[PDB]
Amino acid sequence: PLGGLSEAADSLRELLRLPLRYPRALTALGLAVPRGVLLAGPPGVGKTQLVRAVAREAGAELLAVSAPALQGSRPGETEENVRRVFQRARELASRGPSLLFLDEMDALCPQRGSRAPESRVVAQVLTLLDGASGDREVVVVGATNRPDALDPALRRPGRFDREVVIGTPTLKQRKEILQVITSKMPISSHVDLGLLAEMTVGYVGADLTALCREAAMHALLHSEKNQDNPVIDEIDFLEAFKNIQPSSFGLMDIKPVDWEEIGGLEDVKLKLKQSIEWPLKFPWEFVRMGLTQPKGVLLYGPPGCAKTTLVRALATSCHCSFVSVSGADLFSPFVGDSEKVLSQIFRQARASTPAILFLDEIDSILGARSASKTGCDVQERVLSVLLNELDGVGLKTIEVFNRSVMIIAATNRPDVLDTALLRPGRLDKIIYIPPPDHKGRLSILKVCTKTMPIGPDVSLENLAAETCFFSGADLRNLCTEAALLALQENGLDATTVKQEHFLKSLKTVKPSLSCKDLALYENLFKKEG
Amino acid sequence: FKVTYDMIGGLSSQLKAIREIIELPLKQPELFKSYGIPAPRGVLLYGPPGTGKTMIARAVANEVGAYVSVINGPEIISKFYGETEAKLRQIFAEATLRHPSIIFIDELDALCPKREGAQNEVEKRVVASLLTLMDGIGSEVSEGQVLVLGATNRPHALDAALRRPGRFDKEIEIGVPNAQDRLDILQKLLRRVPHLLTEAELLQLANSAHGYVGADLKVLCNEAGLCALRRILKKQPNLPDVKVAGLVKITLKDFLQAMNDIRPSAMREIAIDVPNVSWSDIGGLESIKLKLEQAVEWPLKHPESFIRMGIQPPKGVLLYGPPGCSKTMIAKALANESGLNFLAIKGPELMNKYVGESERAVRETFRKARAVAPSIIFFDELDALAVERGSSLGAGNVADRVLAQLLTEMDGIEQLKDVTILAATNRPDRIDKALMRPGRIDRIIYVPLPDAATRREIFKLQFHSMPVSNEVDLDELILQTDAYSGAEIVAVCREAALLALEEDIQANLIMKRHFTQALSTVTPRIPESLRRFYEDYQEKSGLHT
């Protein structure tokens, strides 16, 4: 089955179905449906299997010809082979759904600066498709890995433009596909498939297949008695996973967090509530109230407050679709792709049109402008494409369809970023996040400690009095280490914890949150406005 | 395909211009020979992509008498060497035999890139051959009959010698369309599609299409058809194409969602917009209004004011004061009152990594300005580019280049035949007097802070969009809003509305106690010392009137 693929499966179902699931004379009513799509991603996971399955679900000829099996030694035979296949597709259009499936177009497309015959090949298949446009039921699915690998000249409108990625290896789909694979394999009954799954970060389905493969392989190897029924044990499974190569590689944090895992600065909490989530009720609120929605807000606090936690809690308290934007997710070794993934995630926001998009630590996402004057050009290119795309606007004038994503950013070095970002019209609100006061310290200690083994001797208020210049993470690591001391030292197998260990751990973690740095931070990024 | 003038939308003036520059020769060339005055070899078309001038080309081609013949850059310039020229000369001669014919080329800069801007000497051989061929179009046997047509975005990357006379004289611009133009081309498209729309909300939809392009309008039409189709499908499970066709009727919401799904490709270049804001949107400014209308209307009186005495053609008016405080609003207001055209250039954006391309933008800006002569250039935040050199060693270079080229453009003050320039900034000192030297930008006005009546007018324009309570009292509001700016006070009442919303997510009227609360929260981040400095500069500067 289409394990871990049914969502992309059905999206592509409707998309490619639109010309096929419904007749043509309506197109003849003055409409030209796009024809020819792209499936980009690591294959073997089911891409082939899924295109099979969907041509089935609609009812269509699974003409699963492998275009890599058409290479020619002399220019001209290749074009005749393509004539053969595309003509059979044409007679298929003469009969019904010509669901031509041609894989690995990029190997048939070495991009510019390459030799000549690629030109003949691509132009000739272009003739084929542009002519068969006249025919009634001509559709092709180029199956590759990355769209960038294909011919640029094959990405025009009225050409291969409807492109979709293979399924990103999600947890849910991971479990689905493990079960689907083993649905024909005699794995052991007791299987904590979720454990192995969460071990298999970044591992696409096919990787998981292969992993199970070698697992059962060594199972059969180091066992000989039950030659037919293997209890393919989770131990051999684990060891195989260990042996296996790591994965080759917009990850939304599935982890939900509420307003309880966070205390202090409830003023800023209510502010975020003001300028972000009330917009949900907006379609009638500003009506009886006037004021519009501020496009962009920028929350700034000292590095160490883990603002990301607050952002994720916000994303939790709204149910709105959420995607994250991080530099580590961004800094891939492909120059010119950062802008691309930016556009991609914004397009996804448009897709799940109610969308909240987070721009973390943008000083990392966008470094300095003119500090290193030799390698900071593509960064300004991302700057330009950002300043362009950040213009999400609508009718919004005196029922309403609230099709308007929202963008929120946060960082620690705003004095580094490009000043035009803060443009009234792009980022029309900025909020401050001071490190907690005595009360905030007390509260965040209380809430971070509500699961550690507490003893009847501690007095959090004293730490609060003395744990000044402490970040959230500071206090969290502090109570952590102190618990460790208490437990190990006294109770090798313990029950309680004493405050003495916190007192001792104080110096162990040197709090370098100098109040002068606080004043510097504040003055800088309050004049940043 | 029978591509007819009856299909091409907008561009009316340019249509007439091309039609006339081409028709008379292609009608009575022996009149031209009787005059002995030469017949124009070619005409250079230009304009950003998207508007696919090829439309115009094939249109005029199959319109009157032309035998079409087309060649395109990325279609011709392969790894051949002179075989490009071979194909070229062959087309040229064969269509010469076909004297009633017209050759066109797109991306003419592509086939012929810059000499210093390219490397492949083969391409320059092709350049030279094209030159020779075009002189073969200045040939006697067929004097002025092989009309060459060149069209590409970049006029810069073109080869200089192509501008030598008798080779490429008439440069016709086809820029991004305008509100009325968008509407026209949209109608001409929609001509043959069942729809249920009224031309007023249609004009609304047109207004929506900022930075939109024709080709993208066609894509919009197709998209909307598709989506209305989808809408119908979401009411019938199954059906044959007959009733489908019988029911598809494009409506407004269709177009709305359609436009909202696909974004256009324009809006990187300049655009001849139209001032939408009104004097009915700002309060007071009485003497400001009068002095401004005077400043803009005198340059047409200076014919007769010179007839009276004759002294000077004063042009440059410069406002200055607090930051963005309704100033640009006043600018657009005068713009709409005059009915002229607006070309905004926001200062700080002028910084681009592309060394000189900012200059290039300024250059095409002034070109279009001239082309639309009854128009007004605008500037804002001049001090951004006007940070003096030496501070930033590697950054102020493009800045001074840009400022120099700016002076170099404005120089055509005579050429600026009543083409006024309005600018405004906050700290006028930071500029160079190369702009404040007499003749160019001399009339100056400090924008006075809003008086009580202006504040009350701001309050009226605010209350006219929010349901407010009756405990309002304009008096003490105006009292406790001094040292503030208008837009700031708008934000104040906005936040008071937010506070009432905090009182209840479904309340109706905002309470003025919460207004006073907001007043306490908001602080005037502008000290009176700033006004002192403003008025001091006013006193210690050059001319005001």
Is A490 an interface residue toward B (CB < 8 Å)? no
Contact between residue B322 and residue B447 where contact means Cβ atoms under 8 Å apart: yes
Three-state SS string over B265-308 comes to CCCCCCCCECCCCCHHHCCCCHHHHHHHHHHHHHHHCHHHHHHH
CA distances from A326 to A8, A267, B91 (A): 24, 26, 55
Q: For residue A115, count other CB atoms closer than 10 A to its CB.
A: 8
- Per DSSP, helices labelled H in A144-262 are 171-182, 193-199, 205-221, 234-243
> How many CB contacts within 8 angstroms connect chain A with chain B?
82
**Rounded (to 5) percent helix, strand, coil in chain B:** 50, 10, 40
Is A393 an interface residue toward B (CB < 8 Å)? no
Three-state SS string over A437-490 comes to CHHHHHHHHHHHCCCCCCCCCCCHHHHHHHCCCCCHHHHHHHHHHHHHHHHHHH
Q: How far apart are the first and last CA of chain B?
A: 61
Rounded CA separation B374/A109 (Å): 52
Please tell me what resolution, in angstroms, this structure has: 4.5
DSSP 8-state code for residue A247: P
Contact between residue B432 and residue B404 where contact means Cβ atoms under 8 Å apart: no
Q: Amino acid identity, residue B490? A: V
Rounded CA separation B460/B283 (Å): 9
3-state DSSP call for residue B442? strand
Contact between residue A36 and residue A140 where contact means Cβ atoms under 8 Å apart: yes
Is B256's CB within 8 Å of A395's CB? yes
Buried b / exposed e along B63-102 (16+ C-beta atoms within 10 A): beebeebbeebeebbeeeeeebbeebbebbeebbeeeebb
Is B78's CB within 8 Å of A119's CB? yes
The DSSP H or E segment spanning A296 is strand A296-300
Buried b / exposed e along A426-458 (16+ C-beta atoms within 10 A): bbbbbbebbbbeeebbbbbbeebbeebeebeeb
The dihedral through the CA atoms of A506, A507, A511, A515 has a sign that is positive
Rounded CA separation A386/A394 (Å): 18
Q: What is the DSSP string of B171-214?
A: EEE-----HHHHHHHHHHHHTTS-B---HHHHHHHHHH-TT--H
Is A26's CB within 8 Å of B498's CB? no
Cα torsion at A447, A452, A453, A457 (round to 10°)?
-50
Rounded CA separation A250/A348 (Å): 10
Q: Hey, of B263, B392, B488, which one would you mutate to test binding to chain A, going by the most A CBs within 10 A of its CB?
A: B263
Sheet harboring B42-46: ordered strands across?
Answer: B67-71, B101-106, B146-152, B42-46, B170-173
What values do phi and psi take at A9, rounded to 5?
-55, -50
Distance to chain A for B171, nearest Cα, Å? 30
Give ∠ CA A412-A415-A418 in degrees, rounded to 5.
105
Rounded CA separation A334/A482 (Å): 44
Compare all CA atoms of chain B with the CA of A14 and give the residue at the minimum distance: B230
Is A30's CB within 8 Å of B78's CB? no
Is A191 an interface residue toward B (CB < 8 Å)? no
Contacts of B466 in chain A (CB under 8 A): 289-291
Cα torsion at A30, A31, A32, A34 (round to 10°)?
180
Which of A323, A331, A386, A342 minimizes the C-alpha distance to A364?
A: A331
User: Is A301 annotated for ligand binding?
Assistant: yes
Contact between residue A405 and residue A275 where contact means Cβ atoms under 8 Å apart: no
Sheet harboring B376-378: ordered strands across?
Answer: B342-343, B376-378, B421-425, B316-320, B441-446
Q: Hey, of B204, B254, B466, which one would you mutate to test binding to chain A, going by the most A CBs within 10 A of its CB?
A: B466
Which of B52, B65, B51, B67 minimizes the C-alpha distance to B19?
A: B65
Distance to chain A for B202, nearest Cα, Å? 14
The DSSP H or E segment spanning B17 is helix B12-27
Buried b / exposed e along B9-30 (16+ C-beta atoms within 10 A): bbbeebbeebeeebeebbeebe
CA distances from B513 to B472, B510, B516 (A): 9, 9, 5
Distance to chain B for A285, nearest Cα, Å? 7
Distance to chain B for A306, nearest Cα, Å? 27
The dihedral through the CA atoms of B292, B296, B299, B301 has a sign that is negative
Rounded CA separation B487/B478 (Å): 14
Between A116, A119, A281, which is nearest B505 by CB? A281
Contact between residue B365 and residue B345 where contact means Cβ atoms under 8 Å apart: yes
Q: Hey, of B77, B231, B260, B392, which one would you mutate to test binding to chain A, going by the most A CBs within 10 A of its CB?
A: B260
Contact between residue B56 and residue B45 where contact means Cβ atoms under 8 Å apart: yes
Compare all CA atoms of chain B with the CA of A119 and give the residue at the minimum distance: B78
Is B466 an interface residue toward A (CB < 8 Å)? yes
CA distances from B251 to A336, B186, B202 (A): 40, 14, 10
For the purposes of burial, counting CB atoms within 10 Å of the CB of A189, is it exposed (0-12), middle (13-18) or buried (19 or more)? Answer: exposed
Is B244's CB within 8 Å of A285's CB? no
Distance to chain A for B248, nearest Cα, Å? 8
Compare all CA atoms of chain B with the CA of A377 and give the residue at the minimum distance: B353
Compare all CA atoms of chain A with the CA of B349 and give the residue at the minimum distance: A420
Contact between residue A117 and residue A77 where contact means Cβ atoms under 8 Å apart: no
What values do phi and psi take at A261, rounded to 5?
-70, 0
Q: What is the DSSP string of A20-73?
A: HTS-STTTTTT------EEEES--SSSHHHHHHHHHHHHT---EEE-GGGG--S
**Rounded (to 5) percent helix, strand, coil in chain A:** 45, 10, 45
Three-state SS string over B52-94 comes to CCHHHHHHHHCCCCCEEEEECHHHHCCCCCCHHHHHHHHHHHH
Is A254 an interface residue toward B (CB < 8 Å)? no
Contacts of B392 in chain A (CB under 8 A): 370
Contact between residue A312 and residue A318 where contact means Cβ atoms under 8 Å apart: no
3-state DSSP call for residue B435? helix
User: Is A48 annotated for ligand binding?
Assistant: yes
Q: For residue B303, count other CB atoms closer than 10 A to its CB.
A: 11
Q: Across-strand partners of B73?
A: none
Rounded CA separation B39/A499 (Å): 99
Contacts of A156 in chain B (CB under 8 A): none
- Per DSSP, helices labelled H in A190-326 are 193-199, 205-221, 234-243, 266-272, 278-285, 307-316
Contacts of B197 (CB under 8 A, 6+ apart): B250, B251, B252, B255
Q: Across-strand partners of B150?
A: B44, B105
Contacts of A26 in chain B (CB under 8 A): 229, 241, 244-245, 248
Rounded CA separation A355/A353 (Å): 6
3-state DSSP call for residue A313? helix
Between A22, A274, A381, which is nearest B233 by CB? A22
The DSSP H or E segment spanning B501 is helix B486-503
Is A48 an interface residue toward B (CB < 8 Å)? no
* Residue whose pair of structure tokens reads 């003038």 in the numeric block: B5
What values do phi and psi take at B495, rounded to 5?
-70, -30
Structure tokens at B129: 């051959």
Question: B522-531 contacts: CB < 8 A, separation 24 or more?
Answer: B522/B484, B522/B488, B522/B491, B522/B492, B522/B495, B524/B482, B524/B483, B524/B484, B524/B488, B526/B322, B526/B483, B526/B484, B526/B485, B527/B483, B528/B483, B530/B322, B531/B449
Compare all CA atoms of chain A with the CA of B191 and give the residue at the minimum distance: A30
Contact between residue A30 and residue B225 where contact means Cβ atoms under 8 Å apart: yes
Rounded CA separation B462/B438 (Å): 41
User: Is A109 annotated for ligand binding?
Assistant: no
Sheet harboring A355-359: ordered strands across?
Answer: A321-325, A355-359, A406-411, A296-300, A429-432
Structure tokens at A50: 């899924």
3-state DSSP call for residue B399? helix
Give ∠ CA A409-A415-A418 in degrees, rounded to 5.
70
Is B500's CB within 8 Å of A289's CB? yes
Is A26's CB within 8 Å of B465's CB? no
The dihedral through the CA atoms of A357, A360, A365, A366 has a sign that is positive
Contacts of B349 in chain A (CB under 8 A): 420
Is A291's CB within 8 Å of B466's CB? yes
Contacts of B80 in chain A (CB under 8 A): none
Contacts of A290 in chain B (CB under 8 A): 465-467, 494, 497
User: Is A456 annotated for ligand binding?
Assistant: no
